[PDB]
RNA sequence: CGGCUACCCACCCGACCCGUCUUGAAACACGGACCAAGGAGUCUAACACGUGCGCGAGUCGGGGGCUCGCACGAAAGCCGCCGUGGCGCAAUGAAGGUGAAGGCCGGCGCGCUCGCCGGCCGAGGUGGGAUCCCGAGGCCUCUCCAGUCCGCCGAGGGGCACCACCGGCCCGUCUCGCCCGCCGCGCCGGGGAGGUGGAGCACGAGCGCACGUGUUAGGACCCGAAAGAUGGUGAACUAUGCCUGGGCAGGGCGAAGCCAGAGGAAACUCUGGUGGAGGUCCGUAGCGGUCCUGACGUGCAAAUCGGUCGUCCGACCUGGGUAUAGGGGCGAAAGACUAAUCGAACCAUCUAGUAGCUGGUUCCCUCCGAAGUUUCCCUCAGGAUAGCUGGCGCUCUCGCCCACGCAGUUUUAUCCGGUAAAGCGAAUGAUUAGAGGUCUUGGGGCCGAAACGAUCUCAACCUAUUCUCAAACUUUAAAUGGGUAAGAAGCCCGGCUCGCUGGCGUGGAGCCGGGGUGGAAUGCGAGUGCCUAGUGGGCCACUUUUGGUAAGCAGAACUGGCGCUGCGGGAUGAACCGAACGCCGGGUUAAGGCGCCCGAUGCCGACGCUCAUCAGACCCCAGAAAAGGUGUUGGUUGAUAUAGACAGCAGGACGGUGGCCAUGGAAGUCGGAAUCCGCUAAGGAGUGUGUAACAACUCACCUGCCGAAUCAACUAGCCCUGAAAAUGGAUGGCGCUGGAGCGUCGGGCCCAUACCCGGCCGUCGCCGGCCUACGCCGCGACGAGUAGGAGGGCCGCUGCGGUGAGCCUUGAAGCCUAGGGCGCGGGCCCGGGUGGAGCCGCCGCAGGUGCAGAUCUUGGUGGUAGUAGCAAAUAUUCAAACGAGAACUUUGAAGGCCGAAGUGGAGAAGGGUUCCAUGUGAACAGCAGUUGAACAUGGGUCAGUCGGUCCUGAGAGAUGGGCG
RNA sequence: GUACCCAUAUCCGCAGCAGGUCUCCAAGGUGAACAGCCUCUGGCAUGUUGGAACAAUGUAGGUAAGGGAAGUCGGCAAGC
RNA sequence: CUGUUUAAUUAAAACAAAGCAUCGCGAAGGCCCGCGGCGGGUGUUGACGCGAUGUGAUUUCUGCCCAGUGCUCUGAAUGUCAAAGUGAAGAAAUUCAAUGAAGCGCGGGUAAACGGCGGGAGUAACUAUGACUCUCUUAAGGUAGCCAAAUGCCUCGUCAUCUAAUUAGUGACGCGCAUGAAUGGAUGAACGAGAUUCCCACUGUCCCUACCUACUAUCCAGCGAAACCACAGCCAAGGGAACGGGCUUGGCGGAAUCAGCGGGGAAAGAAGACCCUGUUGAGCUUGACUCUAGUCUGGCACGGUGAAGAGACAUGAGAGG
RNA sequence: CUUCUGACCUUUUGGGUUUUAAGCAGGAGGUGUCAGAAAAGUUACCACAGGGAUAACUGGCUUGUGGCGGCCAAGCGUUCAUAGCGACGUCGCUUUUUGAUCCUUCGAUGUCGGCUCUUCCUAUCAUUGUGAAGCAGAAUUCGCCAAGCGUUGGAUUGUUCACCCACUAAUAGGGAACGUGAGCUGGGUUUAGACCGUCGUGAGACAGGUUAGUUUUACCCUACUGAUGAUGUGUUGUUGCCAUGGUAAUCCUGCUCAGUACGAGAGGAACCGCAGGUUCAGACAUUUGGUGUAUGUGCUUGGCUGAGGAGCCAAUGGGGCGAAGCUACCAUCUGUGGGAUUAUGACUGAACGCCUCUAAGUCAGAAUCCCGCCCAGGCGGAACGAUACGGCAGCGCCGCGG
């Protein structure tokens, strides 16, 4: 009662049927796992961007449109 | 005259018997004698997903009620103040409980990491994103003005679905914090800011019906066990008691008791009779069954027969009645017997019990098409999980100087490794040998009373060297290989925000706006989701490799193949070498081959080698080495030959010197040291022949005749030796020798389903037409296939609603058919003949729906075959009769057997009319029959005194009683 | 109740199956005898068929010159 | 010894058996059955009996071990000790303590109860063998006997006899792998359908076969099946699932047959009884696991009357260091 | 599941207070078969579903082990490497030893040994023909062609093997599914009974020993043996031929040769021949012996026919003789030559001016081989005979024409 124990034959020819493609990798990669201190920085950074970035950036857009 | 045909026959070539387990099937693996009918994935519940329909934040009457009692009405219809209820619309906590809105602007409180107020909008934002919109400019017959109208658009705008990310909100917890509320001021509530767990929200998509697939529970694809439980039936065989009856020829051995005689003093002894005891001896019936391992062994028989046997007054044999009943009985004990069954009887039910295990698993065509691997399991014949497959789609991309994305690939850069190899005078580990040196000893020798007093030697040590190694060593270090990059997600500029960081407006991230896509080669359409079958027993080949002596052995790596696969070669084959398959006509080739089987060299083919008394003849491959050859053929390196070798013929083979060792010979000749010189042409102070010794003689050495190559080693091609196995045999055979062998090649030639060209069918894709739009044509690329999956079937069987002014007694169904056809088929249509009363087409619908098998079930018939076989116990013959008919019936005669423990005369149990007569001879009697126990008709069993009835026995059984 | 078989053909054994089954009566000769053999009373046609011939092998039986276990696991079988 | 047994493979050396032992029990008992009752059986019985075993005539014998394992007797002797009962803490559920039946452990006996019975080293005026001596050691270390046996591996042990020759048979030897005393040892007249060897007589068992009879078998008259059967049946070699009939290449091959014969058809019988797997079972056994009838105890009821003594509690007085 | 810890935690079901219990969060108590069942043995009385995924028997690959060889030459062999051996090493062959593997069969291939019987191999024990020896003769040893023909009788053990006695010319080695069970035998192994020893507390085990223990069927096809036959020649018969197949003869002794050769002697040959024998084959029955049912003859037991006479029955009643026939190595008879050649020995003669058996040529040469002699004669053929009345016929050769 003895059988062939382990092999890796006929494995590459199975793997390359559908193809060994890459893992997609879309834009704006997943941001979990990054440094919590940096993340606590960047969240308040974003919400205060969206808070105070109206007036002076609108001024600078008017200024750069007047220049060009 | 034409004709395909399931008619028959001839011929060439191909051609092993199907189904399944299997890596492998024609297998000396299993199932199948033949034929007809039956025969296997159904139904319900539940779930998931896809599909079709209706309604839609709803939906559903499936439970009831309502209508007159009408076949189809067990239908259908209605309810809505019948929505009770299911599922969903809201999740989350263990629970107490709690429970999804933000954005934009203006202002205030220190706008302070902070809260409040006022207005408006309303599910935030970033990058892609089908579509839509706008549009510079572009183009339509003289020049001006014209409008629709035409179409491409660089670029720009809003942006569906969906994807990716950030931000927001709810609930549970954790951390840090301060403020507010007051049916009552408290170990009371409410709130804030962060990081986390959630099956969440972030404008909802379900519900009902039906169909498909898959999974699970059910007898659940079909058949299959040894078992277990419940409840009953058996002691007619057998086991053992008990009761009541029955049975056992003759003989041999000769105890107790007795008698007589003799002896003795007594005790008692001796001799001859009588006597008839024995779990006693030979042997009959009876009972058993040892041996022949005899006969038989599809028998006479599901345990017999024939010889030969054991025991027969006994623990004997035996009939009837009666008792003991299944985990129980009984057992002189063998686990034997208990109705042909016993190491747990028989019958029915639970029961269609269970099975990871064998066997089977029924119509066609089209398309796609595997795996025998990872992990886990009391897992190792199995399952779950990934991987491989198929189906269903969906989202984009095309068509009208350049795209998106991708890659079993290369290049250009750039990293990584520690194997092949190499290395030890580089570490570690082993290891050979020589040389040099003088510190250290011990040990040898010598000068010496002794002294590192001096010296020689030894080992050890060190120094540079030298030979060989390493999977568990290494400085070095390949080839093959692995990753990344080769641009708009990128550059560059400018600015805002940050509680993070901090000399610094510093760093880093994020956000916003702007600017310029031509950034290696080559090829292609890509991305993505669901469901899920089969698979989880492998094997071979090149190369690299582990264990082993080795294997057609076991175990690995990379790639291919076989399995799942044909075809052309290797004769024959799974795996080899070419090459992969729709059906065909022409041409060409591949791998191979061209004496003849057998298509092609039937070339005035090229060059050489080899003769075998066992030749040789093509990867895998199907038998051979070490060694040797003056067999021949090349080749290498030397040595001789013109001042003549080489072998052949001819001449000699001395002298100082019978030199010396000896006096056994030796005057070169068994043995010993040696060894010079002269003459020459050269002689060896003599190789040997032979006289025991003296001697002729030769060899070494020398010279003539001679005429041109010769000698010695060594090497590799063919061939030979080495070479021996069982039935007679294998380059395939026949054969084959100026080849039909070996090696080198050439020119022609042969052919596979490969390639090309052309036709035809189908699939797929890309379309085209306002012609069954589910049809029609057009274009082009392709078609293999087991397990498996889908699609189509105007394939088929049976039934139901609809329809064909369907079909038929002027002949339907079914059956047969050397008849005519169609389709690639499933099958069908017509003709002809039987046949005698129902049948089909189409659109839907619903199934107990299609046979070769399952040692399938039932029914029938073959081959074997007019065969084996009608043989245990001696045996018949003649005449006559009745009769269609006489080996068997009956009578006579004759000859026989059974031979009184019978083949006789009568009974018990059992059988039930068989008893008897008459009549028949169809079937039965295993041949026949006038016969019978066969069939048909009709008869026969007479009792106070024969027995049952009556009695009790072994026992069985009722009331009283007790238990249940 | 009373027939009949009571068994190599009326029972059981799947049957007209050499199997099995309970008892009584039992002559003459030989002989010890109901031993085996032959007759008599009393039954019977040879046991589910016949004819022709006399091969092998058989199955049952019987002899053998010399030697007497040499055969064979064994004197098994047969013979004394 | 006679007897009996596995009917349908064994006839025995097995079984019983008389004889010998051993054990329980004086009836409110032993040993059993039974679902149940003082229901049955032994029992219509009473130790010369009933019940349960071992051994197996007589004759002669019955050795040594209580360590293990059983069995048994003994005492609340004292550790362990279950319900119920007592007492304490607590609002109570509950908790704790003391007391403590059987049994277990402690102690005694038993081997005609199961069973068991050593190995070294030296040592005698030729060598060997070794009575003796020392040591470790167990509970005891095989005593009387007996043997290459039915028990002895090595093994065809060694010697003698038997035969020409003997792995056989007998007789003796004994540090006997691993003999042995009721697990019975050793003899032993009679008898074994028991097993083995040799001798005499006898013979077809043989050298060596031959013949004869009966019944078949043969042919014919009649009447006639069954097993089995993919297809059918000539061989060599090769390859192949590795030993073809069928494939390939060769050898070759005439219809239809009868009587034989057993080489083949890996013939036919039978889903291998040997082996392995199964998470398939049944017999059995015990110091496997989980239980249970039966049984031994303790408690509570049925369950009463009379007398006496005490353990300890309840109360207070006196001694008490 | 238990246990412990943490919160002024939650729930403890009509509402409260307290005990208790449940819960959240995180630590421990174990699953060593370690992703975790709680677990002893035996079956020879066994059963069931299966496996050739998996042993025992053969077959196949392999050749360590076994057996059989070859090369080199240190030595042994009085001297002397190779007459005969040969270490140290080394290369092979064999499948008759054992082992390895699991490829085939587990819905069965009957398993050891013996008896009988056929054929084959050669790695030759003897015989024929030869060569070499440390071959004087004899007796041996080693080689070559060579498997034609032989290779026995017995005691033991079941044996293969082994060992022994005796014969012999010699007691060679093997294969064919470890040939051969529808041929036997069943002694052993290998069931169920039983005993003994060891082991196990036990059911029981023991390639430890002893003993008793059912061996099935052929009529199918092929093969083989034997017998009818079948095709063509018109029929049919006689006489025959031979293609092909089969093959059988073999060995020893005595007497002369001769106690001669040879040998110091002890010892001791060979050829031709002449007698026989062994083994085998083919016959045959005059003799000898069997057989005996001419049921031939004559005794004889018991019974039967009244008795003598004649007979009969007793599964051929017994035994005494015995015809014919069948038969025996238990009687007798017969068994035979030609050719090419192998091994070897030579001749002539080059290669190689010599030599040489070889290179071309030749010769002698045998139990081998083939044929003769001897068996059977084919989908093989000859030569010859007669070739169909009766009453028409019928049938042949020749000529025809339709
Ligand atoms: Mg596997
Ligand atoms: Mg299987
Ligand atoms: Mg296999
Ligand atoms: Mg097949
Ligand atoms: Mg089959
Ligand atoms: Mg069959
Ligand atoms: Mg049918
Ligand atoms: Mg509601
Ligand atoms: Mg059970
Ligand atoms: Mg039961
Ligand atoms: Mg019952
Ligand atoms: Mg009875
Ligand atoms: Mg007696
Ligand atoms: Mg006697
Ligand atoms: Mg007798
Ligand atoms: Mg008798
Ligand atoms: Mg009997
Ligand atoms: Mg009998
Ligand atoms: Mg028999
Ligand atoms: Mg027979
Ligand atoms: Mg007697
Ligand atoms: Mg039972
Ligand atoms: Mg029975
Ligand atoms: Mg079923
Ligand atoms: Mg069933
Ligand atoms: Mg597995
Ligand atoms: Mg797919
Ligand atoms: Mg490495
Ligand atoms: Mg290396
Ligand atoms: Mg499936
Ligand atoms: Mg599997
Ligand atoms: Mg392998
Ligand atoms: Mg394998
Ligand atoms: Mg497969
Ligand atoms: Mg493939
Ligand atoms: Mg292929
Ligand atoms: Mg081919
Ligand atoms: Mg080939
Ligand atoms: Mg082929
Ligand atoms: Mg073509
Ligand atoms: Mg070519
Ligand atoms: Mg040709
Ligand atoms: Mg050469
Ligand atoms: Mg040849
Ligand atoms: Mg296809
Ligand atoms: Mg009618
Ligand atoms: Mg129709
Ligand atoms: Mg029809
Ligand atoms: Mg129906
Ligand atoms: Mg059906
Ligand atoms: Mg059918
Ligand atoms: Mg089928
Ligand atoms: Mg069948
Ligand atoms: Mg049938
Ligand atoms: Mg039939
Ligand atoms: Mg016959
Ligand atoms: Mg017949
Ligand atoms: Mg008869
Ligand atoms: Mg008449
Ligand atoms: Mg008449
Ligand atoms: Mg008759
Ligand atoms: Mg008689
Ligand atoms: Mg009678
Ligand atoms: Mg009849
Ligand atoms: Mg009549
Ligand atoms: Mg009558
Ligand atoms: Mg009647
Ligand atoms: Mg009267
Ligand atoms: Mg009376
Ligand atoms: Mg009663
Ligand atoms: Mg009467
Ligand atoms: Mg009878
Ligand atoms: Mg009888
Ligand atoms: Mg009488
Ligand atoms: Mg009388
Ligand atoms: Mg008298
Ligand atoms: Mg009869
Ligand atoms: Mg005789
Ligand atoms: Mg005689
Ligand atoms: Mg005699
Ligand atoms: Mg013997
Ligand atoms: Mg006898
Ligand atoms: Mg006699
Ligand atoms: Mg009895
Ligand atoms: Mg018997
Ligand atoms: Mg009693
Ligand atoms: Mg005694
Ligand atoms: Mg004792
Ligand atoms: Mg004690
Ligand atoms: Mg208590
Ligand atoms: Mg005491
Ligand atoms: Mg001594
Ligand atoms: Mg002793
Ligand atoms: Mg003798
Ligand atoms: Mg003997
Ligand atoms: Mg002992
Ligand atoms: Mg003992
Ligand atoms: Mg034939
Ligand atoms: Mg063959
Ligand atoms: Mg092969
Ligand atoms: Mg073969
Ligand atoms: Mg062979
Ligand atoms: Mg066959
Ligand atoms: Mg053929
Ligand atoms: Mg025949
Ligand atoms: Mg036969
Ligand atoms: Mg089976
Ligand atoms: Mg398993
Ligand atoms: Mg059983
Ligand atoms: Mg409560
Ligand atoms: Mg309450
Ligand atoms: Mg695990
Ligand atoms: Mg068990
Ligand atoms: Mg037993
Ligand atoms: Mg296998
Ligand atoms: Mg095998
Ligand atoms: Mg088979
Ligand atoms: Mg068989
Ligand atoms: Mg066979
Ligand atoms: Mg021969
Ligand atoms: Mg054999
Ligand atoms: Mg036997
Ligand atoms: Mg035996
Ligand atoms: Mg036995
Ligand atoms: Mg016997
Ligand atoms: Mg035949
Ligand atoms: Mg001939
Ligand atoms: Mg005579
Ligand atoms: Mg005579
Ligand atoms: Mg006579
Ligand atoms: Mg007389
Ligand atoms: Mg007279
Ligand atoms: Mg007379
Ligand atoms: Mg008479
Ligand atoms: Mg007579
Ligand atoms: Mg003869
Ligand atoms: Mg010659």
UniProtKB/Swiss-Prot annotation:
Residues 1-31 are annotated as: Disordered. Residues 1-25 have a biased composition (Basic residues). Belongs to the eukaryotic ribosomal protein eL29 family. This is Large ribosomal subunit protein eL29. The gene is RPL29. The modification N6-acetyllysine is found at residue 32. The chain holds residues 2 to 69 of 159 of the full protein. The lineage of its organism: Eukaryota, Metazoa, Chordata, Craniata, Vertebrata. The modification N6-methyllysine is found at residue 4. Signal peptide: none annotated. Component of the large ribosomal subunit. The ribosome is a large ribonucleoprotein complex responsible for the synthesis of proteins in the cell. It comes from the Eukaryota. It is found in: Cytoplasm. The modification Phosphoserine is found at residue 30. Component of the large ribosomal subunit.
């Amino acid at each position: 009662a003895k059988s062939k124990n382990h092999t890796t034959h006929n494995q590459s020819r199975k793997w390359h049927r559908n193809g060994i493609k890459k893992p997609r990798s879309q834009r704006y990669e997943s941001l979990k796992g990054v440094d919590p201190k940096f993340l606590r920085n960047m969240r308040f950074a974003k919400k205060h961007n969206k808070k105070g970035l109206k007036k002076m950036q609108a001024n600078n857009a008017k200024a750069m449109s007047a220049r060009a």
